[PDB]
Paper text:
The AAV vectors are composed of non-enveloped T = 1 icosahedral capsids, consisting of 60 viral proteins (VP), and package single-stranded DNA transgene cassettes. A major challenge for the utilization of AAV vectors in the clinic is the presence of pre-existing neutralizing antibodies (NAbs) in a large percentage of the human population. The presence of pre-existing neutralizing antibodies in large portions of the human population poses a significant challenge for AAV-mediated gene therapy, primarily targeting the capsid leading to vector inactivation and loss of treatment efficacy. This study structurally characterizes the interactions of 21 human-derived neutralizing antibodies from three patients treated with the AAV9 vector, Zolgensma®, utilizing high-resolution cryo-electron microscopy. The antibodies bound to the 2-fold depression or the 3-fold protrusions do not conform to the icosahedral symmetry of the capsid, thus requiring localized reconstructions. These complex structures provide unprecedented details of the mAbs binding interfaces, with many antibodies inducing structural perturbations of the capsid upon binding.
In each map, the capsid was well ordered, while the densities for the Fabs above the 2-fold axis could not be interpreted for model building. As for the 3-fold antibodies, only a single Fab bound to the 2-fold region, in two potential binding modes, resulting in distorted densities during icosahedral averaging. For the sixteen 2-fold binding Fabs, this strategy resulted in maps reconstructed to 2.54–3.56 Å resolution. The localized reconstructions with C2 symmetry relaxation confirmed that only a single Fab is bound at the 2-fold region. In all maps, the VH and VL chains are well-ordered, enabling the building of atomic models. The epitopes for the sixteen 2-fold Fabs comprise VR-III to -VII, and -IX of the AAV9 capsid. On the aa level, all 2-fold-Fabs contact D532 and Y706. Other frequently contacted residues are T491, T492, R533, D556, N562, N704, and Y705, which are clustered around the 2-fold symmetry axis. Furthermore, for all the 2-fold Fab-complexes, movements occurred in VR-IX near the 2-fold axis. While, for AAV9 capsids in absence of Fabs the residues 704–707 adopt the same conformation in both symmetry-related VR-IX loops surrounding the 2-fold axis, there are numerous variations of side-chain orientations in the different Fab complex structures.
Numbering used by the authors:
A (entry chain H): 20 to 143
B (entry chain F): 219 to 654, 670 to 736
C (entry chain L): 21 to 131
D (entry chain A): 640 to 688
E (entry chain E): 419 to 542, 560 to 612
F (entry chain D): 220 to 233, 239 to 295, 306 to 435, 471 to 688
G (entry chain C): 689 to 736
H (entry chain A): 349 to 435
The structure:
């Protein structure tokens, strides 16, 4: 019974970094990867990147220069930071758990749980 | 023997020896004085009794009783894992119950703060009903069990029973039982009490899931020599009636002739854990399956053993069809779904019909040149010759045994909440403080020892099984452990069915 | 890396099997068996349907969905189409550069 | 040592204060304040060279 | 070599076998909506206990029923029509329809109504009332069964059981001599 | 020995029946265990989905009466089985003509599964039995089994069995195989028709007993103009749903085929239908099939196409008429009696009662004797003989084998106790 | 054997409940046996 | 059976006092398990000491047990007179 | 012992008794020159 | 019993060493 | 094994070779014939 | 996360014997990775 919940701003001015947190409830961050996926309205899904409980992170190459993620295991939540948000950044941001079996060397590519999603608007 | 000599030791161990397991549990208990040493008539009319379905009449007694009837009393979470992964079946054999280290305390409330001191001359009464003459309240799944975690100290539940009632009033045919009218051993601080019991022969509980389904038992390579009727007409046209027959074979397995059919069904309404899928109305009692007895409606709970859902639909559950346990620290009334743990009998789907599905269809008429074939849904089905079915699974938090009601007839007495039905179940153990009134309570130790017969898995299955396991994880707490407050908790219900068999 | 390529829309009449394909390079779909499919309804989060090319999640996915892969192309087949079936579908793969890429998605309409 | 002198564990058995007169399923959180004393003798034989 | 014929009346009923003082550790579904309005769905659960004894989990259920038409000794209550043969519960064999007399033993009538009797249920007029503890009333339905799948579109529906064959976990009393 | 017989021919009925036949065992799947499923066989229907395995092993089936019988009560007691005079032929193709030569050093593996550890396929009434006439030579069928499935896929709880993982007895041409089996106690199969009927031991009279259960079948006339002009073979049929899959109710509870004087009709799935010698596999007319009837049990058993009875649906009062409703399906009620379904010369003998917590009246619905420990499966295959290896070591298993098959004799002896 | 006194359940080696085209550690539709993953021996635990 | 975590070889306080007339407090028993941090892994174990069989003693009862040491070498209570290099 | 007399049978099983396990494997081999 | 001693103090070294102490155990 | 045990180790070994079958091969043009060679031997020994 | 260079052989742990260098495989028994770091494995330190 993992339940993801994320919170953040509705509206954000341009050239301002965007911060978003996601709280895992009913289960812990544990040994799983934790990903951020954004969907612009009427557009396809895009994988921003994920973070692991030990802080190891991987990001989308296109967004890699300006994206920072952080996990906090005590508060049982993880967050996302985006730099220089513009018009393109407006999206629904989902925080989805990415399946990973601890201890085997198997890439973790797919999302078996999802957050409700948050709508972020970049506008002046 | 002596006031300064302990009358028993604390035994808490599990022993595995071949085909048998011996469990031993010891707990510290506290027995208060209930009803100020009085027997008091009780009914709904005391509470006001607004409904006839809830109407009752009975008595409450000064006596308490011991209840070890749940599995987590006798098994640690590891021993339970050790049981269900390695065995196809188990069942109780012997029982040994001991009572010792009795301490009777006397309370004085003097001005502001109360004072406790030992009453060294007081007694405690304990006896067992081995002739089953009292109403048997143990098989009703009441709270008050020996606590699963041994370092906890539990309070003994008050004994009470019900008899016949008409509304809230009694009737002439009702009975009244005085427990003082039984001989009972009396115990002071140096005395102990023990008795042993022998379970009557029961079938092994089946801790396995079939690796086949009832409808797939055929050889997939070979045809039957039976025929079925494929066509009743040649095609589009008039007066096209014909009779056409085909061999039943690997291509169409649904029409093949079968020796055995699935078990009986009494249908339950279907509820989803995703609320927006549920209908927007209050249907918890109104839309529920039930049976009527002498004018009263008892909800059908949990009911006959039936699969909770079809394969791949875990969000649905039968309304009254499942056993539902509370999580540690969950309130009594109107808790959220996340506060409770809903057990699901998915493993019985191979031979048992889904609880929320119809049993099948029957023919409702005579077809003819003037009339089409008609069918109608079977919403409930009683036993037919050639049915096979699985009983309800047992859980670590669930009951062990029940008392088979004393009747002229019964069919498959296996109790519907799961476990071992017995016409002579483990006798009730009644205990109370002797009146002296002076405010007084007692405490002591209770040890219970059950021997368990096992049935080993002989399987030739090549690929590995499914085992109950604790997966690698990193959380604040350990599962099945105390937290930083010292509160023990069982995070989930654990079933017994992991290993498999052929059907 | 570069995105997975999917047809923009597909439609099928109720009760008939339909297939959605997604093409990828020899580095994503072609090299690995790490392909997953997601089904999304409007205003809701995507739901995992296929993982590991043909595997389905233990609960919440009917047996009517099946995944498959040939060469550089992966495919999602839905049979016995229903009204609930119409949704947006996404291909997703694990690439050669250890990153996750998805398809553009295909909208499926049931008549 | 592989099998050293074993640990010797000891506790005061808890004694509950007066429990309520209506039944409640919770574990008992109220005990009599209590402690114990006694004597301990340990005799070790030693071999000399 | 036959079983002893039981010659006693139960001092308990199948649905009261619980301890009246104690809660069960089981839960039931108490409430499906938070209130009145649109999109109020919820799942609330509560403990089964002495205040609501209908919803408690039980291990044993009453015996099988094949319903009888109900007839009142007070004559005015009976309908003014000849329903003696048509109304009667019957069974067909080889095309010959035989009356179900006496048939499955069942409580002749509900407590408080001794004017009523099963049309073909009782020997002639004795009553079987002693068995109303574990046996379903002859003139009453066995119970209710869900007849559909509720959904956000379709509300839950139940039908009546006019006859119920044996189930595992049934108990019953045979007919008195 | 290579030139001496290991057994003789016994084919006489004394009650001790004795059969003997000659069989041929081919090579199945080229010594491979291959996963099979509905998708493998073309799929499509949910009710027909399946998952399983086909094995290189074959098996023996005597489960039909015409195997042991030449043309009140009885029941089997002992079983005795022999496999002897083994002969192993190998085959080689020069151009387009084939050669057959004895291979004397090859073996034939056989074992019985007497702990019932394999899926038990002898209770599904399949083809592949010993031929009813002693002169025929029959092909031994291939063994395969099904396990759990969802659609054409496998759930994690699915099992895979390797029959090579059983200890088996290996036979060269001079070796023979035998074992005996003791039938567990069954009630005698009744071989009589009641001279009395349940209601005549008057329609209003009190009776002590009532007829057995019913699950209604739809009624079908052999005069086709009587039948409705529509396709109702599947739509009008009786079924039971298991795990979302609908299976036909066939043959179903034991019921009388028809009322007195209504010989023409038969319950849609309610009867055992046999093919005549030379009957086609698909869409054969009504005169190509033998349709058994259950009119014999109509005394104590309700017509399969009829309702069990009527029941009151309400409470009458001066305002309301007494109402009734029809009972299509009626399960066991205390006081019922019934007769099981009859056994036929062509019909099966036994079935294996599934291993479950509970069952009622385990007698199998197609007829015959239900046994929790029935006669065990007898498994057989030709041991693979590889061709010439590559002479440089190759990690891979060897896929090139010599073509081969075997032949020999089978004798099955059953003591029958008569009432 | 283990005599362990650990209260909470161990880690065990287990097959997942999965919906797959093939079953793990079994032949495929072509008759080829496979071993999907390397299985170690270390699941149960002990005190140090 | 050495089934508990064995904390005695860690050189903790709580010993019997060296002078025979001093009255000492008995130290509390606790143990450590696997951790990734302040948190626990699935391999972390929890032991309940109530789950061992134990002996219960009132004011008149006493408790004794005997234990044999396993064979261990003599600790050398001496200093060498020669050096390894000047042998 | 002869050409037409099998010199051994096929054993492929594991037996668990007490503290010991007895595994038996049987395979078919092919030896080139 | 209550009014008797269950053990005698022993504190001598013989090589056999013996020790005895008084302890207090809280909760 | 690995779920139920803290350790294991081999004890005894019993090895058997049997059902020896020697095949002599004759290659002529594209076809090849394989037939039993009945008098042929196999050498087997253990280095103990 | 790995370096863009060819280090399979030049970066390996090895032991020289009689003038020949042999890779240290798998070597002494050591934990494959520090906790929370499943992604890393020792070059030759494991069995593959």
């Amino acid at each position: 019974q993992v339940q993801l919940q994320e919170s953040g701003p509705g509206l954000v001015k341009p050239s301002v970094t965007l911060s978003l947190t996601c709280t895992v409830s009913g289960d812990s961050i544990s040994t799983y990867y934790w990903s951020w996926v954004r969907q612009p309205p009427g557009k396809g899904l895009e994988w921003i990147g994920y973070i692991y409980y030990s802080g190891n992170t991987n990001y989308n190459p296109s967004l890699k220069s300006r994206v920072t993620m952080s996990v906090d295991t005590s508060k049982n939540q993880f967050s996302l930071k985006l730099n220089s948000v513009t018009a393109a950044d407006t999206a629904v941001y989902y925080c989805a758990r990415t399946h990973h079996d601890y201890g085997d060397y198997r890439p973790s590519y797919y999302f078996d749980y999802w957050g409700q999603g948050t709508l972020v608007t970049v506008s002046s | 023997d002596g006031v300064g000599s302990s009358s028993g030791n604390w035994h808490c161990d599990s022993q595995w020896l071949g085909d048998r397991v011996i469990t031993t549990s010891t707990r510290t208990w506290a027995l208060p004085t209930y009803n100020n040493h009085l027997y008091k008539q009780i009914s709904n009319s005391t509470s006001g009794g607004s409904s006839n379905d809830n109407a009752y009449f009975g008595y409450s007694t000064p006596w308490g009783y011991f209840d070890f009837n749940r599995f987590h009393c006798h098994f640690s979470p590891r021993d339970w894992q050790r049981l269900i992964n390695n065995n196809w079946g188990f069942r109780p054999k012997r029982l040994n119950f001991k009572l010792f280290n009795i301490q009777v305390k006397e309370v004085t409330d003097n001005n502001g703060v109360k004072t406790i001191a030992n009453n060294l001359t007081s007694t405690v009464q304990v006896f067992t009903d081995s002739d089953y003459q009292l109403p048997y309240v143990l098989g009703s799944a009441h709270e008050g069990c020996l606590p699963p975690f041994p370092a906890d100290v539990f309070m003994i539940p008050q004994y009470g029973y019900l008899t016949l009632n008409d509304g809230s009033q009694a009737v002439g045919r009702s009975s009244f039982y005085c427990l003082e009218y039984f001989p009972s051993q009396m115990l002071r601080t140096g005395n102990n009490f023990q008795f042993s019991y022998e379970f009557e022969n029961v079938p092994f509980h089946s801790s396995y899931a079939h690796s086949q389904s009832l409808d797939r038992l055929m050889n997939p390579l070979i045809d039957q020599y039976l025929y079925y009727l494929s066509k009743t007409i040649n095609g589009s046209g008039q007066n096209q009636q014909t009779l056409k027959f085909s061999v039943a074979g690997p291509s169409n397995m649904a029409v093949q002739g079968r020796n055995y059919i699935p078990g009986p069904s009494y249908r339950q309404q279907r509820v989803s854990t995703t609320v927006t899928q549920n209908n927007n109305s209050e249907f918890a009692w109104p839309g529920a399956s039930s049976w009527a007895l002498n004018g009263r409606n008892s909800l059908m709970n949990p009911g006959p053993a039936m699969a909770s859902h079809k394969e791949g639909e875990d969000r649905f559950f039968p309304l009254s069809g499942s056993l539902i346990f509370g999580k540690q620290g969950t309130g009594r009334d109107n808790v959220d779904a996340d506060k409770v743990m809903i057990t699901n009998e998915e493993e019985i789907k191979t031979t048992n019909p889904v609880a929320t599905e119809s049993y099948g269809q029957v023919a409702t008429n005579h077809q003819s040149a003037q009339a089409q074939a008609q069918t109608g849904w079977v919403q409930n089905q009683g036993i037919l010759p050639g049915m096979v079915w699985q009983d309800r699974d047992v859980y670590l938090q669930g009951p062990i045994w029940a008392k088979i009601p004393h009747t002229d007839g019964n069919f498959h007495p296996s109790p519907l909440m799961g476990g071992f039905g017995m016409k002579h179940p483990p006798p009730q153990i009644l205990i109370k403080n002797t009146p002296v009134f002076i405010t007084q309570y007692s405490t002591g130790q209770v040890s219970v020892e059950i021997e368990w017969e096992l049935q080993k898995e002989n399987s030739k299955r090549w690929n590995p099984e499914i085992q109950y396991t604790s997966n690698y994880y990193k959380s604040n707490n350990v599962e099945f452990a105390v937290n930083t407050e010292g509160v023990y908790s069982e995070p989930r219900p654990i079933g017994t069915r992991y290993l498999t068999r052929n059907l | 890396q570069s995105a997975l390529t999917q047809p923009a829309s597909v439609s099928g009449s109720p009760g008939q099997s339909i297939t959605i394909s997604c093409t990828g390079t020899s580095s994503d779909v072609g090299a690995y068996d790490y392909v997953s499919w997601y089904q999304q309804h409007p205003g809701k989060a995507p739901k995992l349907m296929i993982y590991d090319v043909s595997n389905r999640p233990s609960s919440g996915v009917s047996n009517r969905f099946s995944g498959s892969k040939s060469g550089n192309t992966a495919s999602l087949t839905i049979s016995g189409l229903q009204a609930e079936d119409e949704a947006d579908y996404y291909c997703s793969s694990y690439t050669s550069s250890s990153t996750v890429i998805l398809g553009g998605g295909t909208k499926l309409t049931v008549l | 040592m592989k099998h050293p002198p074993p640990q010797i564990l000891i506790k005061n058995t808890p004694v509950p204060a007066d429990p309520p007169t209506a039944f409640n399923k919770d574990k008992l959180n109220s005990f009599i304040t209590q402690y114990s004393t006694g004597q301990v003798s340990v005799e070790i034989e030693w071999e000399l060279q």
